[PDB]
Structure formats: C-alpha cells, structure tokens
Amino acid sequence: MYDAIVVGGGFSGLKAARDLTNAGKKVLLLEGGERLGGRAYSRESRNVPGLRVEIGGAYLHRKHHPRLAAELDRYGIPTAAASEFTSFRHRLGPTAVDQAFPIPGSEAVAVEAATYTLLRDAHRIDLEKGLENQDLEDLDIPLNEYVDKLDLPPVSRQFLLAWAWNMLGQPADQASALWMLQLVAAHHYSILGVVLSLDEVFSNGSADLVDAMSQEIPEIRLQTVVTGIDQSGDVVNVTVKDGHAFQAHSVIVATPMNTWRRIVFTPALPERRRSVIEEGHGGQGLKILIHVRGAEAGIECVGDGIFPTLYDYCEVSESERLLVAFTDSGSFDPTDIGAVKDAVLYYLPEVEVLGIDYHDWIADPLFEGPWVAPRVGQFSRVHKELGEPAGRIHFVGSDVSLEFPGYIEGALETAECAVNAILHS
Amino acid sequence: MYDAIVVGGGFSGLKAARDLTNAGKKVLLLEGGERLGGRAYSRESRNVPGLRVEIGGAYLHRKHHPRLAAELDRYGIPTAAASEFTSFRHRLGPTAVDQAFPIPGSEAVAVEAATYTLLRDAHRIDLEKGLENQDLEDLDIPLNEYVDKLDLPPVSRQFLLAWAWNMLGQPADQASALWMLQLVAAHHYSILGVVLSLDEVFSNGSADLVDAMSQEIPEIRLQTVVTGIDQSGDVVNVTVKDGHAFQAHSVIVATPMNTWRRIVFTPALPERRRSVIEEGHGGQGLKILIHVRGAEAGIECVGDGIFPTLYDYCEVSESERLLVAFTDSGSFDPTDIGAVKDAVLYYLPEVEVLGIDYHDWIADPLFEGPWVAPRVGQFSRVHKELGEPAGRIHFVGSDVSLEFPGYIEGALETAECAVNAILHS
Ligand SMILES: Cc1cc2nc3c(=O)[nH]c(=O)nc-3n(C[C@H](O)[C@H](O)[C@H](O)COP(=O)(O)OP(=O)(O)OC[C@H]3O[C@@H](n4cnc5c(N)ncnc54)[C@H](O)[C@@H]3O)c2cc1C
Ligand SMILES: Cc1cc2nc3c(=O)[nH]c(=O)nc-3n(C[C@H](O)[C@H](O)[C@H](O)COP(=O)(O)OP(=O)(O)OC[C@H]3O[C@@H](n4cnc5c(N)ncnc54)[C@H](O)[C@@H]3O)c2cc1C
Ligand SMILES: NC(=O)c1cccnc1
Ligand SMILES: NC(=O)c1cccnc1
C-alpha cells in the first residue's frame, strides 16, 4: 500500500504524482492507456509519414499560464512562438476586411458597446467561488440567444460566433453564454485574450514535458484501467480491469470528467455531483488536421463555414502544408472527405485536400470527450464542487478548474491544490 | 410691455423667441451685438478675400442632434457630409499607424480594458439629474490624473489625450475627468461618438439657419446690451446700456454663462449659483483656421503637438487650403505666426503657413469664453441648477444643457424646456 494513488497520467496526474513523490510520499501512478499525456497527444501524422503532429492540446501563453511556464523553465523545454498569419481569407460578408481583426470602422460603435456588455457580464464572475455560487443563472443560457440580445452587425456578430464555436467546441445553440463569459474572465477579463493565448507552442511537442515529468515518477503502471475506488475501509481500495487491487490512504482521480461515471465509487459520490457526472459535459470540439496542396503559408480564415476557423498549422513540403480546422463532432463528420473538401473550398477554393487526421476523443473510452464545456444549465447548478474532495478521494484536472478550464494550466493548477491538501492531511 | 423678453440671439434665444411667438405670445428679442447667431459665427475669411468660413460651431450629427435635424428639415437647409480624411500624419510615436484609428494591435488588450473602465464610469452619469446630484465627486478630478490611473500605453494614451484636449478646450491638468465622461454619456455612452459627431456641416454655414429662424421673429433689437434684470416689481424690468427699459412678465437669459456676472439681477440670484457665475467656466477652446500652401487634401493629424489636432478644413485654390487647429487659449498665442509655423511644421514639415484667422471669444465682451467646460470641482458642486428658473427669469443655452453641453443641440434643447415652462405659467 501507498501514501497516494494517482489515477490518470495526463498533466494533472503527472504533476501530482511528481510533487507528492518529491515531498517524500510513496506514490503509485495508474494509467489506463499505453501512453502518458492524456488529452496532450503528440504522435506522427496519419497523412505525412515521418511528421510529428500535435493531435490535442498545443498552445500556451506565459502571462496567462505561469504554472506551465515554470514547468517549461524547470526542464529547459524549448517553445517557439506559433506560426504567424500573413494572409486572411474570411467568410464574413462583403464589408469585412482581410486582416487579423476584420471588423470594419462602420461597426466600431457597436463593437465598443458590446465590449462594455461582454466585460460587465464577465466582471460578474469571481473565479474562486464556482459558477453555481454567484447568482449567475441569468447568464446560463444558450449562446445564440445571448449574442442575439447584443444585437451585433454582421461582421462582428459572426466573428464572435466563429471563435466562440472554435474555443467552446459547441455550436452556438448548445454553448452556455455563461461559459463563454467564464473564458473571458479566465483570460484576465479579456475577450481578445481568449484568442491571443494561442501564443506559443512546444518546439518538439507536448511529449517533451510529459517525458521530463514522468522521469521523476518512480512507480507508473500503463494499461491499468481503474474500475472501482472504494474507501469504505480504513485505507482506500483501488480496483482494476485485469488485476490485483492496490491500496492507499489517498486517491487522486486525475481522469477526464466524462469518465468518472465508468468508475464505481464506494460510498457513492455526494449526491449533488451525480447527474452531471452521468450526463457528462457538453464539450464536442473537433480539431482536424488537413493535408493540403495549393495553400501558401500564413493563411487564417474565420467565418460562417461549417469550419468557423481554418488556418495554417505547418509546412509539409514546398507545395504542401497542414491546415487546422475547428468545428464540433455533432455537426461535422471528419471521415467524409468530400464534406471536408466542401468546408475547405468554401474559404479556400484553390486548395486541394490530400487527406485528414484527427482523434475521436469522444469514441475513445479513456476520454469520451475533448476539452470541457458544460451543457447549458449544468455549471450554474454544480461546478465548484465537482473538483472538491469526497472523503479521501480528490478530483483534479482541466475539466474541473475554476481558474483555467480546458487548458493545461488548469490541469496543473488543480493538482497544486490537491497536493497541498494531501500534504496537510 | 411683453409676454417675454428673450435676452441673447444665439440659437437658444432664437428658438425660444420663435416658439413663444408662434404660440401667440408677444415677444421681444434683445441682442447685444450687431449680428445674430452668437457662438455660431460665419463670416468671411481674414486671409482669403471672398471666402466664407465658420469661425465657431459648425458640425452636426443627425442621430445625436434630432432637434438640429428638425430645424434643418423645417427650413430645407442643405447640409453636406464633412471633408473626408484620406491622409494621416500623426505624432503618436513610432508604433502608431497612419490611419484614422491609429492604435496598433500591440495595444488592443489595453484599449479593451480602458474601454470598459471609461464606459463603466460614464454609465455612472444619468443625464437628467445634474452632475452635482449623483455622488460623482470621485470623478471630478484633473483629467491628467484620471488618464494616469488608466495606465495606457503610448499611442492610445496620447490619442485619448489629444482629442480630449480638442473637445474640452483645456489642457489635461485643467480639464475635469468627469466632464470628459459627461461628453461620453452625451453621445449615447460612446467614446468613439465624441469624435464621430463631427459628421455634417452646413453647406452655406450656420447663417442659413440663423436667418430662417430670425425671419419668424417680429421684434428684434440689435446693439442692445442688457445690464440689469429686475424682477422686484410685479413685471420684470430689463435695463440696457443706452436706453429706456423694457418690461415683461417673463425673461429668458439666453446669453453665455460667463456673461451673467456682467448683469445685475434683482433680487440677487439663488446663492448656490453665485461663485460659479463669478469665476465662470473653464472653457478655453481655441480653434484656428490656418491658411497654407503645400498641403494636399485630406490630411488629419492627431498627436502630442501644442496643437493636439490639425486637419483639413477646405480647399482654397489648387495649391492652397485651410487647415484647422485646435488648442487652448492659455497655452498658445495665435498671433505669434512663428509659434503657429512651429506647431504646424511639427506635424507637416512640407507645409508653409500663409496666415491665420480666429476669434478671441474670451476677449469678446459678448461671450468671454468659447464653449462651456467646467473648472475641476465646479460641476459636481453646482450644475443642474445653473439652468433652472429663478423666479420669472429663465436660464438657457449650450452652456447649461445637461443633455448636450457645448453643441447647438444643447442650445436648442434648453429652449424647448423653457418655452414649455412659460406656456404653462
Ligand atoms: C483537441 C484539443 C486541443 C487542445 N488544445 C490545448 C491548447 O492549445 N492549450 C492548452 O493549454 N490545452 C489544450 N487542450 C486541453 C488540454 O490539453 C487538456 O484539457 C489537458 O491536458 C487535461 O489534462 P488532464 O491531466 O486534466 O486529463 P487528461 O490529459 O485527459 O488525462 C487523463 C488520463 O487519464 C487516463 N485514464 C482515463 N480513464 C482511466 C482509468 N479509468 N484508469 C486509469 N487511467 C485512466 C487517460 O488515458 C489519460 O492519460 C486541448 C485539448 C484537446 C482535446
Ligand atoms: C470655436 C467653437 C466651435 C464650435 N463648434 C460646434 C460644433 O461643431 N457643433 C455644435 O453643435 N456646436 C459647436 N459650437 C458650440 C455652439 O456653437 C454654441 O455653444 C452655441 O451656439 C451656443 O448658443 P447659445 O444660443 O446657447 O449662446 P450664443 O450663441 O453664444 O448666443 C448668446 C447671444 O447673447 C448675446 N449677448 C451676450 N451678452 C448680451 C447682453 N448682456 N445683452 C444682450 N445680448 C447679449 C451674444 O451676442 C449672443 O448673440 C462651437 C463653439 C465654438 C466657440
Ligand atoms: N476550454 C477551451 O476553450 C479550449 C482550450 C484549448 C483549445 N481549445 C479550446
Ligand atoms: N463641448 C464640446 O466638447 C465641443 C463642442 C463643439 C466643438 N468642440 C467642442
């Protein structure tokens, strides 16, 4: 038996397991899959033999992600400032302007007014209290209705919608307007910052940092799927698909939120948390890497397409590249290459699709979902609590961060606080 | 004797005198000078024989100035959309960009945040209550300190300051930050709108509308300076520099605010109003028409010069134009043509000054000031009341508008309410 069992080896689990270990605890780390990193997946392209692609979470911004910045600085991990955009091909109607910020002057007075409204509403949210504890229900409505109340003229209406589609991974009518605001608050009460935090990338991918952190964890078991976590006894008992149980004083659940319903907890979890855990969160972000000929470097496209955003990802050859599309999985079928062609040609009619590459996070039983985004109504009923301790069992990870939900910095933050919790118990 | 005496024949006096007359009152209009229009002065250029220039208030914007729009529509007065700007020559440092909106992206996140602060503060002001009745003292401080608290990066700091200098007619340390906000509220809670209301001009100058309105006033006396307004008796007694008094049930003071201290009121005015009336308001706007060779059409310059703004006014010849500078009278001496050359060359080094043209509103005893702007501290002590009736004597005009101070629309608004007041008495 162990001081702690860390269940899940994404960034959250890895930090906790490392920090407890360095603090002198006897820690075991249990990972269901055959790799470490979780939703930070860097592998080789399915399209381009020999090329390494980020299939999940890639970007960072130091001023917003100090914890991540410290990890990179600790292990000397190189980051490069992300591909600049020299070329704009929006689908925002004829009055829009082909630059990074495509709102035209004719819309400025409306943008000014909406900027005040968006920021006033976001200033409502205090990021330490939980979205259920601040009388924020009037905000917890479908985003399409929220944006309809703002009454924005065409370019900015659709610019806001397209980036809200990309970032939330939900179509406008499934997204919570209050979650959109939670992101604005996360970024220092900035709308712009939600998009400008696409600031840096790992020169050699997330795997660098995954490896540096795991180097410092002495006991890791891959292919070890947890199926029950039982704290009826004096000492927590962790049960597993094929194998002898493991036992520890503390357990940290560092697995996706949408997977918790596949573990048997004993006793059953506090009763507030239970419907949300069953239904899961609404996140459906679909990120597609598209292999293309005919595209020049630097293209960014935002607009009303089934891909709200489509932009450069990297150079493949002198005539070939990868672009990246965002849309959501219950709106687009990534295996319908003709669909993909139509979505792309919509913005970029000169460009031939050579192939596509994605991960079905939803279909993956180790995840059942990409990054968190609540269903309308969920997080103003229960939110802070989904990541509070239940007995000797802690809950951590991006999904349950109040400070940064959906980003690595969130995975790292939630583990700080759990590690600290345990160190005092 | 008359139902009403209207004292002053700027736009405020002219509307009142006309509306009372049309309502069937026996009205006399008394004007101290030799022309009608007041601070709306259109005469011939001192520089360009035969050319008609606006020396005072020229611009309008229909959506913000419905009363003005109705006057223009009533008399079929043509307006032309004001000279467009094709050419930018700012002095905002090396990171600024030569277009109408010169803030660079590097400053966007700061602009966003200040936009929220500026608009939150302006939303504090409710335009019907008066600036002294809303607990707004924390705002009634020097603008330089306010803008220092906002902590803006160079381009936008100086862009805001330069336009606040132009619009308020005061250097930053003499201007009330709360007045700056009053203007933002006046324009529908818009910062941008304060500058975008430079939208239209009178094709043939303000005089058109001055003449249409005066056509409908049957009794006007020019060169008739009022020196005492005495309402001790049953009927108000109006005394005059050289001449027999005039008498009326009602008197409307439609003269500048900074002139009221040159009239003897009986009884003396309510005691709150009296210090402000003595000291006067702080407005020192100085608008200079500059006759130039070497300038092309379309130039707008904003920057840190002794002229915060310098831009095209109109074509004189194919090689000659007028520009317009704004600055303030206690900072620049318009008769120092070398000073003017330096101020201009600062922004426009290729341009030769041929001459200048201005009106000393301050030195003019019929005005003693250009448009209103309070001294720091004044309008959060007394404001609404300066334009409330004192006995049978009413007070109207741009200076005392809560809705639009410094614009014609304000002169027109304050006269509506006085005319209505009288019609019910
Ligand atoms: C498409 C996409 C793009 C993204 N882009 C960014 C970005 O640009 N910047 C950024 O900061 N973040 C980004 N992210 C979000 C971020 O990468 C993740 O939210 C973050 O890595 C979450 O890590 P975690 O440690 O909380 O959980 P995860 O990384 O998901 O780790 C959970 C671990 O638990 C394991 N597991 C699951 N079930 C069991 C079981 N029962 N027993 C044992 N182990 C189990 C899984 O195999 C996994 O290793 C992106 C995410 C996605 C999906
Ligand atoms: C440089 C400058 C630029 C401007 N630009 C604009 C603009 O772009 N758009 C806009 O809407 N407004 C503008 N204005 C402001 C606007 O023109 C004035 O505030 C407005 O016309 C005020 O009119 P009024 O009727 O309130 O007073 P005034 O027009 O000033 O009229 C007062 C009248 O009283 C007379 N008078 C004074 N003393 C006596 C006396 N004791 N007895 C009898 N008569 C007396 C004066 O001769 C005058 O006719 C500008 C003003 C200035 C100074
Ligand atoms: N939570 C988010 O909005 C998010 C994070 C990373 C990538 N895309 C979206
Ligand atoms: N009150 C004002 O700011 C004003 C009005 C007209 C011209 N300049 C300034």
PDB file of C-alpha atoms and ligand atoms in Angstrom, chain B residues 166-168 179 183 326 371-372 405-407, ligand 4:
ATOM      1  CA  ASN B 166      -9.537  69.367 -28.723  1.00  0.00           C
ATOM      2  CA  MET B 167     -13.050  68.650 -27.469  1.00  0.00           C
ATOM      3  CA  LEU B 168     -12.830  70.130 -23.975  1.00  0.00           C
ATOM      4  CA  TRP B 179     -16.676  66.380 -17.774  1.00  0.00           C
ATOM      5  CA  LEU B 183     -19.353  64.044 -23.099  1.00  0.00           C
ATOM      6  CA  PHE B 326      -7.488  73.095 -32.056  1.00  0.00           C
ATOM      7  CA  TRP B 371     -17.969  76.625 -25.482  1.00  0.00           C
ATOM      8  CA  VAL B 372     -18.544  75.534 -21.879  1.00  0.00           C
ATOM      9  CA  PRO B 405     -23.251  70.852 -23.436  1.00  0.00           C
ATOM     10  CA  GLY B 406     -21.164  72.728 -26.000  1.00  0.00           C
ATOM     11  CA  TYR B 407     -23.225  71.759 -29.036  1.00  0.00           C
TER      12      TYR B 407
HETATM   13  N1  LIG C   4     -18.481  70.695 -25.702  1.00  0.00           N
HETATM   14  C1  LIG C   4     -17.592  70.311 -26.637  1.00  0.00           C
HETATM   15  O1  LIG C   4     -16.835  69.424 -26.360  1.00  0.00           O
HETATM   16  C2  LIG C   4     -17.402  70.868 -28.043  1.00  0.00           C
HETATM   17  C3  LIG C   4     -18.459  71.208 -28.883  1.00  0.00           C
HETATM   18  C4  LIG C   4     -18.176  71.690 -30.167  1.00  0.00           C
HETATM   19  C5  LIG C   4     -16.856  71.835 -30.628  1.00  0.00           C
HETATM   20  N2  LIG C   4     -15.842  71.494 -29.814  1.00  0.00           N
HETATM   21  C6  LIG C   4     -16.102  71.014 -28.567  1.00  0.00           C
END
